[PDB]
């Protein structure tokens, strides 16, 4: 009964730019920022009786992969060191241009970022923001993970990555590619006549 | 690597009516007709950068199920007996209103049809019409079955069912539901920004 | 369920003459020619509601046997040596009366022909000419071999034999008997009343 | 040597109507009738050099299946009970409109017939009428069963079914489908030129 | 019988340039293009009685290897990230200079391309374009793969690679080397005298 | 790594006539002659950037087969007996019209020739003529056999067969077919653009 099995696992991606304007400040400082993941940016609206480009009723993000592809040449100087941390409760360190320290260096989920010409990636299970007042989430567990309704445009944000890049005397530009490993359930294709 | 596996098996259906107008002819006669299957009638066009409602590049019909759901009450008289046969080369018996015999009764692939209040179904692997001048097709073999490009509106006809219903003194109406067990390959979702 | 098994294997033959007019040319030369096989020449049209002499819907040629039965007496002189080659892509060497060499001698599928009073035969799986622009064909494989619609008069050519007979000072006449080992499928006998 | 094996097993059918006009008679009475089977009604004449639609020289009927498909609605009243019996010697009870008893009820080969909306079928080995003066026939034995010449129109009758339907206050119409499981031997296709 | 074995496996290559003109556009954009493979570009015409440089009658492409050899120095900046995807049905994304997204990123057969000084290659079984109206092709299966006639100049296109390179502020030039792993069959060398 | 294996074994042939004019001499006499084998006569020149019809750099003749196909009818008289001998050092008995004895009858490598209507063949490893002043050659040994450069027209002679046919009162004509079992090495196909 393979044809009645309503599960479909796939991968969705999008790439956007991110830049850290050069600063003249002498001593070490960090640019603090963060990322949320919303399936709205990965699934275009559909057409006709099928509102969404993928004909499924439910979904759940199994894993998220964030890749920082450096634009800077491998000959660039004033190299720095930063951090990326997994934030599962939607509580990120306030966005900042030049904090006097790396706010994420001590996080348990911290990974070191080498700048400005190195690749860097994080792979983890993000969590949906179910209630921003309590910010609760499920422990990692594939079989008990909540199912979400696949919407056309009002999808819920999935939370996960905070970063801190050390500022430089030169601009540091990246091409960030986010990939969601989604699991869709319940085929629901509508087929109007003519 | 489940998320990179580009195969997806699903089921698609559509229901249309079919009627056999009552005839006054005395002696036994048969209404001869036939059916082709085109995925155009099962997949609505998509929207935006995704031309088709299912984001896949290739496909192949593994199986087809044709169901004749009788409309006539189980109390109807002048019951008759007909035939349904699998036609894999696109060569059907000429459509007729009252042939003096059942043209399909002797076909090897013939199944008996009880009229007019009984259910009847056929399940088989249809074949695409690759060249109507030679009408050639593949023997049944799951791993060597040809892959076809999934098109928006110019899809190729898949051939398969010829029928012969015995005429009656009363109208014999059916609701025909065709179901295609399709196998899609190569996820190709396009995701334009904004 | 032997009676519902729609397969029938049989053998079909036809015999026609072939002559190589004597030439006066001194030095060795070869008469180049070729053969195609079309089931049209093996199956006469049928009658009534059954268009073809054998009541089957599909067919496929499993094997072809070409026999050259010499007419010349075993006492004839100016004996020569030629070649026969299997051509599966419908690309034969141009027909010629006296080529200065045997164009088929080097073909991998070449078999030597002893002239003019010897028997010679070839046995192989011919291939249908599906598209003369690309000339593609299937490797030998009984279970995946394409099925073809049995037509009354527009059947497709099956390709296979090229020959080169060395010219002689005497006429060399043969009786060529071609035998097709065909496999028919799907009994479809129509039985009109009276 | 499958291609030289001159045996071919197939199934042939034909459907004709049969009605039992309503009678006003009070007490139980039976309509007595009978059936013979002649391959003439199953094989149309051929064309050209092939006199018969199936190119075989000999044949023998392995089995015969007689199916009574009721026309009457399942809501019809004055239901009755009759009998069908296998007659292998061509000696049937005289055809009658309203015998005062069921003449076949005691036959060893008798099967009960439920009227008028039930299906009824018999499956048996019929016997050819070789000499109507002695009426002799072979015991059932597949390997010693006589072979018969397949003729165009003078084929011999095969004998087998006698019936007795109880009369009713309403008409009882049936669609009778007879199926012969024939075994053909000796392929004899003629293939004239041009 | 090694000398009568008409199979020969070899490798054929050709190298051509490909450039992506620099663009001034700010935000990420991609240059979309595609590649087809035709043996015409790998086999020069022959001479005399042997029309083609390799004396074989049939062939089939077992594998294709596309290599992108970067010209840009490893010190070049504005690095980007693109995609290459295997297109087996001859349906490529429309050629474009600066699409606002990478159209191939989500394809199942997608591989990431690092620009502009990295090597990148794809290795796969391409498919011949047998009918551009239906675009059907065989699943990968070495023993059932279609054989094609080796032509001098009218060979059929084999389809396979679509690409999307991210645009840059600098020119990105490559030397593309395509290698076909071909299997030839049936030696057919002609040897005219003198 | 089958595609990088530069070895290819094939068979090359050519047929030419040979006649022994009738003589009136009474007593037994023999016509002495000889044969050399040069690949020049088996490989036509190529075209364009590929000088030779087979795109290989080296070669070596593994075996040579010389076949004498008699032209004389099997009813011809004055039958005779001759000899054929393998000459590996390029030193043949002087060509003669009517030697008073068979000069090759005592050679160790001698085989008897039956004339004039019988077939006769020799199969052996010929040797290249490396230096006609010393006439040295290698013992038979497949793995140590010298490799030769495949040239367009200046190829070296391979030596091997001396013959002595007994003269007759009638002409004795033959069709001699020489076949070289060659082993080619190092694919070297050149592929100029356009």
A11 near E CB under 8 A: yes
| Chain F, nearest residue to E41 by Cα | F193
Q: How many CB atoms lie within 10 A of CB E99?
A: 20
Which two three-digit tokens encode residue B93? 């018996």
| Spatial distance between the Cα atoms of F18 and F171, rounded to a whole number of angstroms | 11
Q: Nearest by CB to E75, from A15, A73, A173: name it.
A: A73
For residue F91, with 0-12 CB atoms within 10 Å meaning exposed, 13-18 middle and 19 or more buried, which class applies?
A: exposed
> Which chains have at least 3 CB atom pairs separated by less than 8 Å from chain F?
C, E
- C chain contacts of residue D180, beta-carbon cutoff 8 Å: none
Choose from A12, A42, A53, A74 for mutation: most chain E CBs within 10 A: A74
Distant-in-sequence, close-in-space partners of A42: CB < 8 Å, separation ≥ 6: A12, A13, A14, A180, A182, B191
Nearest to D115 by CA among D14, D13, D28: D28
Q: Nearest by CB to C138, from E4, E146, E149: name it.
A: E146
Q: Nearest by CB to C11, from D3, D55, D193: name it.
A: D3
Nearest to D62 by CA among D106, D120, D132, D123: D123
Nearest to D66 by CA among D102, D129, D14, D142: D14
B156 near E CB under 8 A: yes
Cis omega (within 30 of 0) for bond into F116: yes
CA E123, E128, E129: angle at the middle one, nearest 5? 130
Contact A14 E101 (CB under 8 A): yes
> Which chains have at least 3 CB atom pairs separated by less than 8 Å from chain A?
B, E
| Spatial distance between the Cα atoms of C182 and D12, rounded to a whole number of angstroms | 23
Q: Are C64 and C182 in contact (CB under 8 A)?
A: no
CA C62, C64, C68: angle at the middle one, nearest 5? 170
Nearest to C138 by CA among B145, E146, B137, B139: E146
Q: Which residues of B147-186 are buried (b: 16+ CB within 10 A; e: fewer)?
A: bbbbbeeebbbbbbbbbbbbbbebebebebebbbbbbbbb
| Spatial distance between the Cα atoms of B55 and B190, rounded to a whole number of angstroms | 8
User: Measured on CA atoms in the order D122, D125, D128, D130, is the torsion positive or negative?
Assistant: negative
Question: What is the SS3 string spanning D81-134?
Answer: EEEEEECCCCCCCCCEEEECCCCCCCCCCCEEEECCCCCEEEEECCEECCCCCC
Give the single-character DSSP code of F36. E
Residue B144: strand, helix, or coil: helix
Strand partners, F159: F36, F127
Contact B131 C130 (CB under 8 A): yes
User: Measured on CA atoms in the order D100, D105, D109, D115, is the torsion positive or negative?
Assistant: positive
| Chain D, nearest residue to B77 by Cα | D73
State the residue for tokens 């092939």.
Answer: D50
Contact B80 D72 (CB under 8 A): no
First to last CA, chain B: 30
Contact A13 E166 (CB under 8 A): no
> Which chains have at least 3 CB atom pairs separated by less than 8 Å from chain C?
B, D, E, F
| Spatial distance between the Cα atoms of A5 and A189, rounded to a whole number of angstroms | 14
Distant-in-sequence, close-in-space partners of D190: CB < 8 Å, separation ≥ 6: C44, D48, D49, D50, D55
Contact E5 F4 (CB under 8 A): no
Shortest Cα–Cα distance, D185 to chain C (Å): 12
- F chain contacts of residue C77, beta-carbon cutoff 8 Å: 71-73, 76
- E chain contacts of residue C100, beta-carbon cutoff 8 Å: 192-193
Distant-in-sequence, close-in-space partners of E62: CB < 8 Å, separation ≥ 6: E9, E125, E142, E145, E181, E182, E183, F3
Contact B46 A53 (CB under 8 A): yes
Contact C189 D43 (CB under 8 A): yes
Length of chain E: 194
H/E segment holding residue B7: strand B7-20
Contact E189 F13 (CB under 8 A): no
CA A8, A14, A16: angle at the middle one, nearest 5? 165
First to last CA, chain C: 30
Q: How far is CA C46 from CA A182, B95, C151, D47, F19, in A?
A: 61, 21, 11, 5, 57
Length of chain F: 194
Nearest to A22 by CA among A163, A168, A174: A168
| Spatial distance between the Cα atoms of C34 and C85, rounded to a whole number of angstroms | 9
Q: Nearest by CB to D15, from B28, B75, B79: name it.
A: B28
CA C98, C100, C106: angle at the middle one, nearest 5? 110
Classify the phi-psi angles of F181: left when phi > 0, otherwise alpha if psi is within -120 to 50, otherwise beta: beta
Contact C58 B88 (CB under 8 A): yes
Residue E144: strand, helix, or coil: helix
Q: Are E186 and E57 in contact (CB under 8 A)?
A: yes
Touching F: E residues 33-92, CB under 8 Å: 41-50, 53-55, 62
| Resolution of the coordinates, Å | 2.3
Contact D191 C2 (CB under 8 A): no
Q: How far is CA A126 from CA A59, A64, A85, A122, A180, in A?
A: 14, 6, 12, 11, 10
Q: How many CB atoms lie within 10 A of CB F21?
A: 12
Q: Which residues of A158-186 are buried (b: 16+ CB within 10 A; e: fewer)?
A: bbbbbbbbbbbebebbbbbbbbbbbbbbe
Shortest Cα–Cα distance, B194 to chain E (Å): 10
Torsion angle of the four alpha carbons C67, C73, C79, C83, in this order, in degrees rounded to the nearest 10: 0
| Spatial distance between the Cα atoms of B129 and A131, rounded to a whole number of angstroms | 55
Nearest to D37 by CA among D5, D60, D3, D58: D60
| Spatial distance between the Cα atoms of F31 and F15, rounded to a whole number of angstroms | 21
Q: Nearest by CB to B166, from D13, D173, D175: name it.
A: D175
Shortest Cα–Cα distance, A2 to chain B (Å): 6
Q: What residue numbers bound the domain in which C92 lies?
A: 1-194
Q: Can you point out the beta strands (E) in A55-110? A: 56-70, 81-86, 96-99
| Spatial distance between the Cα atoms of F14 and F43, rounded to a whole number of angstroms | 10
Contact B106 C143 (CB under 8 A): no
CA D176, D182, D185: angle at the middle one, nearest 5? 160
| Chain D, nearest residue to B113 by Cα | D69
D176 near B CB under 8 A: no
- B chain contacts of residue C188, beta-carbon cutoff 8 Å: 106-108
- E chain contacts of residue A72, beta-carbon cutoff 8 Å: 77, 79
Shortest Cα–Cα distance, D180 to chain B (Å): 11
What's the structural domain count of chain C? 1
| Spatial distance between the Cα atoms of F10 and F6, rounded to a whole number of angstroms | 13
Judging by DSSP bridges, how do beta strands B30-37 and B96-99 pair with one another? antiparallel
- D chain contacts of residue B102, beta-carbon cutoff 8 Å: 13, 15
| Chain A, nearest residue to E168 by Cα | A71
> Which chains have at least 3 CB atom pairs separated by less than 8 Å from chain B?
A, C, D, E
Touching C: B residues 116-155, CB under 8 Å: 131, 133-139, 141, 144
Nearest to C125 by CA among C62, C74, C179, C70: C62
Q: How many CB atoms lie within 10 A of CB A192?
A: 9
E6 near C CB under 8 A: yes
- E chain contacts of residue B136, beta-carbon cutoff 8 Å: none
Q: Are C191 and D42 in contact (CB under 8 A)?
A: yes
Contact D47 C54 (CB under 8 A): no
> Which chains have at least 3 CB atom pairs separated by less than 8 Å from chain E?
A, B, C, F
Contact B3 A181 (CB under 8 A): yes
Q: Nearest by CB to B53, from A14, A45, A189: name it.
A: A189
Contact E139 B130 (CB under 8 A): no
Cis omega (within 30 of 0) for bond into B53: no
| Chain pair C-D, CB pairs under 8 angstroms | 89
| Spatial distance between the Cα atoms of C164 and C120, rounded to a whole number of angstroms | 13
Q: Are E83 and E127 in contact (CB under 8 A)?
A: no
Question: What is the SS3 string spanning chain C?
Answer: CHHHCCEEEEEEEEEEEEEECCCCCCCCCEEEEEEEECHHHCCCEEECCEEECCCEEEEEEEEEEEEEEECCCCCCCCCCEEEEEECCCCCCCCCEEEECCCCCCCCCCCEEEECCCCCEEEEECCEECCCCCCCEECCCCHHHCCEEECCCCCCCCEEEEEEEEECCCCCEEEEEEEEEEEEEEEECCCCCCC
The CATH number of the domain holding residue C47 is 2.60.120.950
Residue D31: strand, helix, or coil: strand
Which two three-digit tokens encode residue F66? 């010389």
Which two three-digit tokens encode residue F27? 């007593």
- B chain contacts of residue E106, beta-carbon cutoff 8 Å: 187-191
E111 near A CB under 8 A: no
């Amino acid at each position: 009964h393979p044809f009645t099995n309503g599960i479909f696992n796939t991968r969705l991606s999008r790439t956007f730019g991110y830049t850290i304007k050069r600063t003249t400040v002498k001593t070490p400082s960090w640019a603090v920022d963060m990322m949320r993941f919303n399936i709205n940016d990965f699934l275009p609206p559909g057409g006709g009786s099928n509102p969404r480009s993928v004909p499924f009723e439910y979904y759940r993000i199994r894993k998220v992969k964030v890749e920082f592809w450096p634009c800077s040449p491998i000959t660039q100087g004033d190299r720095g060191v930063g951090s990326s941390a997994v934030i599962l409760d939607d509580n990120f360190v306030t966005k900042a241009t030049a904090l006097t320290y790396d706010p994420y260096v001590n996080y348990s989920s911290r990974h070191t970022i080498t700048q400005p010409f190195s690749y860097h990636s994080r792979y983890f299970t993000p969590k949906p923001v179910l209630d921003s007042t309590i910010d609760y989430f499920q422990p990692n567990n594939k079989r008990n993970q909540l199912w979400l309704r696949l919407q056309t445009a009002g999808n819920v944000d999935h939370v996960g990555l905070g970063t801190a890049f050390e500022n430089s005397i030169y601009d540091q530009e990246y091409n960030i590619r986010v990939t969601m490993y989604v699991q869709f359930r319940e085929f629901n294709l509508k087929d109007p006549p003519l």
